[PDB]
Ligand binder design. Structure first.
Ligand SMILES: NC(=O)c1ccc[n+]([C@@H]2O[C@H](COP(=O)([O-])OP(=O)(O)OC[C@H]3O[C@@H](n4cnc5c(N)ncnc54)[C@H](OP(=O)(O)O)[C@@H]3O)[C@@H](O)[C@H]2O)c1
Ligand SMILES: NC(=O)c1ccc[n+]([C@@H]2O[C@H](COP(=O)([O-])OP(=O)(O)OC[C@H]3O[C@@H](n4cnc5c(N)ncnc54)[C@H](OP(=O)(O)O)[C@@H]3O)[C@@H](O)[C@H]2O)c1
Ligand SMILES: NC(=O)c1ccc[n+]([C@@H]2O[C@H](COP(=O)([O-])OP(=O)(O)OC[C@H]3O[C@@H](n4cnc5c(N)ncnc54)[C@H](OP(=O)(O)O)[C@@H]3O)[C@@H](O)[C@H]2O)c1
Ligand SMILES: NC(=O)c1ccc[n+]([C@@H]2O[C@H](COP(=O)([O-])OP(=O)(O)OC[C@H]3O[C@@H](n4cnc5c(N)ncnc54)[C@H](OP(=O)(O)O)[C@@H]3O)[C@@H](O)[C@H]2O)c1
Ligand SMILES: [Mg+2]
Ligand SMILES: [Mg+2]
Ligand SMILES: [Mg+2]
Ligand SMILES: [Mg+2]
Ligand SMILES: [Mg+2]
Ligand SMILES: [Mg+2]
Lengths: 251, 251, 251, 251
């Protein structure tokens, strides 16, 4: 009930769905949280639904916006003190095969899913290192960082990139004794607001040829592995992939 | 502080080192625990050091002993009620290359590390399935289930076997709606009693070409990932590998 | 057309199906070959169908028979000179889940698929090392060395074991400059005699949720990757997995 | 000696080192080849060193140049007929950690290593599909598509991206019966011109803690696996990773 005592976390894309569940459990475990999203209506409502401004605040930011990343860390420091924990969770999908992906679609997806995670990881190392915070960078990296989907070409590229870039950062932080860990989390199919707006999506995802458990997960499934990775319980885990997917990748 | 409320766990090789830390944290999170080991002096002392017989007991058992597995589950049921959780942690190593492994060494190691995990996993599914327990089988499966060591030939064989056999069991339990999950845990180098009896072992393991963090882990590092996997927090995780290795396999 | 010039190969389970195709292409690329199998009627016919006794011979041997392995290498040396190449291809399956596998089934499958590959790999290193042969041990290791099948529990165990044991042997041979490489080959579904005797098997295997190419492979698909790995073309490849599966593991 | 009979191949970065060896072996196996590079002095010399214009030509092209990709395929078609084979081999490295990578460095590396491979793969599918060519796209994807290097942050990102994007493309081509395969090749350390210009690089790469064989590979090591993947010998291989690394990733 205080597994994140003293932690100060930034969670990108934290105003709905998976990111909001992470933020909710982080606050319940004692962390101070800054959540981001592009829309202030959603974000301010989300923060107030979780706790007081002494526990959680919202910062408007598109994770592809490099300059905004500096302002986000500045604001979080001023509200809560030194940032210890970063969850790079914001991401988008293009439902196109590699063959049918336009270059504009390619660049837009990579700006959020890859450039954004790079900007956050790079800045996080610079701001977290050598502060004795037990710092942890958690990069959201999908079953699509492991297995292809014929209709998710650019998404697959971005998730494979985050999977292995995170190992580079993990190693550099470990070898330099920075007291920063970097790991990736790989959700299978999760019942999100988006999933609920796509007719038939959940049923298709629950077929046993896709998810062997025969149903999809919920946002708290991803929140709990993120609590583990943000806490000092996982102080020896770095450079590794944590898969929570109902068996999807085991077959 | 009650993340394992109501759980009933068997932990093989639970009387020292990693297994004892798992048992200790399991009891602290509300589980009832039966620990095993071959030696009753060690085992009875270990159980009493953790809690009362209402919380934790010892059962003398070599995990290669197929008939003893039945007696172990029987005893645990009689002490604590239906078993929900099994940690197959007992294991041995032969420090021989494949080239230099005698067949007697091969069969002895496989009897503990592979037959034993098979016996426990098979029996666990039979006894746990369809009871609404949120059941979880946690198979200890090493960095040596991922990367070879020239001087651990039979050990590598056994850990690779446990890694993939566990996925078969995970899938069968998921597809049949048994309410049993099966996952593997892959420690890097951990400061155990054995490590402390080998002069120079810890220093060699801490070299950056081996463990990038520059130091080895502690038994509680493995206990905490086991708490996560035994708890209902991980109810969507099955068929997956959880690596806690200080960066060993990331490079 | 002489990619295996001067090589001397043992291929276990070489009298039908995949093993026979490997032997056929090996002979066509200039290797001398000893094929094994349990039945002399099949084996003598198979050898004569491929070439003369100066090119290929049959040796009756169950790969679980440890003492027979010595006799097999002796016979191959006497026929053809020093063995350079070993393909551990003999294997069996039990169509049982982990839950439903009897211990007799478990031990029988491991005797062929795991003990047998260990016996051949161990002996191969001892006999091949330090002879300047460009020696290569090719261990047949399945898509089931990567992904679980709920009805192939013991098979999954054996293939995971061969996958990682082979890396141990690869590393030891490389670090000791033995001039022996060890790699694994991982077929997807292949149209074998066995497949043709199971009604409906090929159609089930060709479903896109199983093999994305929509059809299964043929024995020559596995023969060609084995030629590459046995030849000096692959002199820098060791400790690695070579997957030929129509896309099975990519999704 | 005619394993690529009738094939028409584009090899990016084909004027030196690994790419030139691929082109050389491709021509020796009967393929017609268009090699690319940025510098015409190098490229025209390279082509003429391998064969006549009826066998091999050079096309000046930076693989980050999207519009040039169309012109490259057009020119290759006019010289040799329909393209069957694409090797995306051009790539660059920044020797910076994630922490120390400037955004300009990030974008420059991704433009070549990731955008370029995407442009070539996308165009290759569009131009190769449904032509009965036995088409094959071979994406060069490094040991750094598997394991991190603390000083290769952007490179790791790009190689992880190519690793998994290639599986998406493989699956789409297989499920749509396009007669196009897509696979990745993962060299370890190879003695290239670049390696020879870095004092001490080869010795560092040959340390057993890096390459267990105790020496690095040569360009023909990568050419031979590319011949296999471009030939119809590998007609059942798609969506998979082919590692040729002297044991680097096995430990
Ligand atoms: N027509 C179709 O076929 C189709 C298919 C799929 C989806 N959709 C549309 O997609 C909508 C949802 O898309 P969404 O991306 O907004 O999903 P979302 O579920 O809102 O995204 C999850 C979280 O990430 C945040 N986020 C998204 N992009 C971000 C960025 N660049 N930087 C930082 N945080 C970011 C979101 O807040 P913010 O959104 O406030 O930034 C939210 O907090 C649906 O409501 C629907 O209209 C349409
Ligand atoms: N001379 C050398 O070079 C060398 C090198 C390494 C180790 N050693 C010896 O190895 C000893 C430790 O070996 P160990 O295997 O007993 O280690 P351990 O550290 O005692 O094993 C960890 C846990 O597993 C249990 N366990 C071990 N084998 C088991 C089995 N078959 N079934 C169930 N539980 C099992 C152990 O209890 P139980 O042990 O009570 O069963 C303990 O609870 C050292 O004290 C030392 O004497 C010698
Ligand atoms: N009733 C059913 O539901 C069912 C289902 C599946 C299969 N089956 C039966 O299985 C038969 C085929 O089984 P099989 O294992 O003989 O397949 P196989 O296709 O003959 O095996 C492939 C190759 O491996 C060899 N081999 C097999 N076991 C070996 C061992 N222990 N050591 C060395 N080489 C070995 C085989 O020769 P040798 O066989 O001569 O040793 C052959 O050269 C079918 O003909 C059918 O009767 C029945
Ligand atoms: N000072 C230092 O510390 C340091 C360190 C490392 C390297 N270097 C410099 O790096 C030079 C080599 O770099 P390099 O990238 O030219 O290596 P390279 O060895 O020439 O590259 C391999 C192949 O890829 C081609 N290629 C490179 N970039 C390409 C692109 N964007 N599109 C298509 N093909 C491409 C190359 O031809 P083209 O090059 O003709 O395009 C060649 O065919 C050295 O000669 C040295 O001057 C300096
Ligand atoms: Mg939104
Ligand atoms: Mg799969
Ligand atoms: Mg002991
Ligand atoms: Mg037979
Ligand atoms: Mg150059
Ligand atoms: Mg490694």
């Amino acid at each position: 009930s205080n597994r994140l005592d003293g932690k100060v976390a930034i969670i990108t894309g934290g105003t709905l769905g998976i990111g909001l569940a992470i933020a909710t459990k982080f606050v319940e475990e004692g962390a101070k949280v800054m959540i981001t999203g592009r829309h202030s209506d959603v974000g301010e409502k989300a923060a107030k639904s979780v706790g007081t401004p002494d526990q959680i605040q919202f910062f408007q930011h598109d994770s592809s916006d490099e300059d905004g990343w500096t302002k986000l860390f500045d604001a979080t420091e001023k509200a809560f003190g030194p940032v210890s924990t970063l969850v790079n969770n914001a991401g988008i999908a293009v439902n196109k095969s590699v063959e049918e992906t336009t270059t504009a679609e390619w660049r837009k997806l990579l700006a959020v899913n890859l450039d954004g995670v790079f900007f956050g990881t790079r800045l996080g190392i610079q701001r977290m290192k050598n502060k004795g915070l037990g710092a942890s960078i958690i990069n959201m990296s999908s079953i699509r960082g492991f297995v292809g989907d014929p209709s998710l070409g650019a998404y697959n590229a971005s998730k494979g990139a985050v999977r292995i870039m995170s190992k580079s950062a993990a190693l550099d932080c470990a070898l330099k004794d920075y007291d920063v860990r970097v790991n990736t989390v790989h959700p299978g199919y999760i019942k999100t607001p988006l999933v609920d707006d796509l007719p038939g999506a959940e049923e298709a995802m629950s077929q046993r040829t896709k998810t062997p458990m025969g149903h999809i997960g919920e946002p708290n499934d991803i929140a709990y592995i993120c609590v583990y990775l943000a806490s000092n319980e996982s102080k020896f885990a770095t450079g590794s992939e944590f898969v929570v997917d109902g068996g999807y990748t085991a077959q």
